Amino acid sequence: TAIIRIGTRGSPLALAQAYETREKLKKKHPELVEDGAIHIEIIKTTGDKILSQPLADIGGKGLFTKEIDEALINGHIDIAVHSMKDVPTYLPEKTILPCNLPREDVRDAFICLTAATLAELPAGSVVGTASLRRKSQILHKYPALHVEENFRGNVQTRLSKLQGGKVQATLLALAGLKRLSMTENVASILSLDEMLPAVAQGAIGIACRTDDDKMATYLASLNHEETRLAISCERAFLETLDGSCRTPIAGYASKDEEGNCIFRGLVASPDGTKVLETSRKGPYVYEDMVKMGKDAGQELLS
Ligand SMILES: *Cc1[nH]c(/C=C2\NC(=O)C(CCC(=O)O)=C2CC(=O)O)c(CCC(=O)O)c1CC(=O)O
Known part of the structure; x- marks a missing residue:
C-alpha cells in the first residue's frame, strides 16, 4: 500500500513531471523515499488517442486531463500531475489545484x-x-x-x-x-x-481532492507561490477570452526586479496578419493579478 498514488499521463515528459514531483516530495517527507510509498498510476486520456488531425480541429474540453480528473475525484489516485498549459480554465468539481512547481x-x-x-x-x-x-x-x-x-x-x-x-x-x-x-x-x-x-x-500543476487535507498538506510543501500567482494571472486572462490550446492567444506574467507583476498578453488572427497585444503592471498579489489578467482580457475583447 502507497501513501500517495500519483496520476499522470504516460509519455516520457509526463513521467518526467511526475518524477520531479516524487523527488521533491521525498526531500521534504522522507517516509516517501521507500519504494512502496509512492505509486505512479499512468492514465490514458482522449488527447493520447486522437493524434491524426490538428489540435484546433478537435472538439471538447480536457483532452489531456479528463480521465485523470475522474481518477482523482473518485479515489483511484491521490494527486494528479499536469502540464499547466493543458489544464482547462474550469477546474473539475470536487478538485482543487493548490500547487505549482x-x-x-x-x-x-x-x-x-x-x-x-x-x-x-x-x-x-x-x-x-x-x-x-x-x-x-x-x-x-x-x-x-x-x-x-x-x-x-x-x-x-x-x-x-x-x-x-x-x-x-x-x-x-x-x-x-x-x-x-x-x-x-x-x-x-x-x-x-x-x-x-x-x-x-x-509550469507543472498538481491537483488533489477538495476534501483531502492530508494531500493538501503534502502539496503545500511543493507549491511555489510566485509561480502559482503568475499562472493564476495568465489563466484569468485566458478564461476571460474563453481561450484554450486551440486558440491563438498567448500570455506571460512574471515578477520584475521591483517586485511587481508585469503581464503581456496577445491575441492574433490564425493567418498572422493581425495581432493585438496588451500589457499591464501592478502589485504581485493574487487578487490584483487575477483582476489584471481579467482587465487585460476585457481590453483585448473590446
Ligand atoms: C496547450 C497546448 N497543448 C498542446 C499539445 C500537447 N499537450 C500535451 O500534453 C502534449 C503531449 C506532450 C508530451 O510529450 O507528453 C501535446 C502534443 C500533442 O500533439 O498532443 C499544444 C500544441 C503545441 C504545438 O503543436 O506546437 C498547445 C498549444 C500551445 O500554444 O502551446
Whole structure:
C-alpha cells in the first residue's frame, strides 16, 4: 500500500513531471523515499488517442486531463500531475489545484537540422506546429513560411518527424526539452519578443481532492507561490477570452526586479496578419493579478 498514488499521463515528459514531483516530495517527507510509498498510476486520456488531425480541429474540453480528473475525484489516485498549459480554465468539481512547481524557462525552442533560425529558412519551408498561437506568431513575422498544422504527438514523436524530414522545422517548449534532457535538439531559442508563450507554459500543476487535507498538506510543501500567482494571472486572462490550446492567444506574467507583476498578453488572427497585444503592471498579489489578467482580457475583447 502507497501513501500517495500519483496520476499522470504516460509519455516520457509526463513521467518526467511526475518524477520531479516524487523527488521533491521525498526531500521534504522522507517516509516517501521507500519504494512502496509512492505509486505512479499512468492514465490514458482522449488527447493520447486522437493524434491524426490538428489540435484546433478537435472538439471538447480536457483532452489531456479528463480521465485523470475522474481518477482523482473518485479515489483511484491521490494527486494528479499536469502540464499547466493543458489544464482547462474550469477546474473539475470536487478538485482543487493548490500547487505549482517552480516554473521552468517559458520560451519556445526552434528545432531544425539545416537552419539556425526562422529567418534562415528558405521561403516556402514547412514549420510543423499544431498550435494556432505559434502558427499566428510565425506567420506574422515570416509570412513566406508554411505552417503544417497536422503535426502531433509526444515530444519525441515530433522530434522523430523532424528527423524523418516530414517538415523542415518545428517548435517545442524549451521547458519540455529541459525536463527530458534533450536540449541538444535546440537550434535556437526564440526571445519573448519573437514568440510569446502559451498561458502557463513551463509550469507543472498538481491537483488533489477538495476534501483531502492530508494531500493538501503534502502539496503545500511543493507549491511555489510566485509561480502559482503568475499562472493564476495568465489563466484569468485566458478564461476571460474563453481561450484554450486551440486558440491563438498567448500570455506571460512574471515578477520584475521591483517586485511587481508585469503581464503581456496577445491575441492574433490564425493567418498572422493581425495581432493585438496588451500589457499591464501592478502589485504581485493574487487578487490584483487575477483582476489584471481579467482587465487585460476585457481590453483585448473590446
Ligand atoms: C496547450 C497546448 N497543448 C498542446 C499539445 C500537447 N499537450 C500535451 O500534453 C502534449 C503531449 C506532450 C508530451 O510529450 O507528453 C501535446 C502534443 C500533442 O500533439 O498532443 C499544444 C500544441 C503545441 C504545438 O503543436 O506546437 C498547445 C498549444 C500551445 O500554444 O502551446
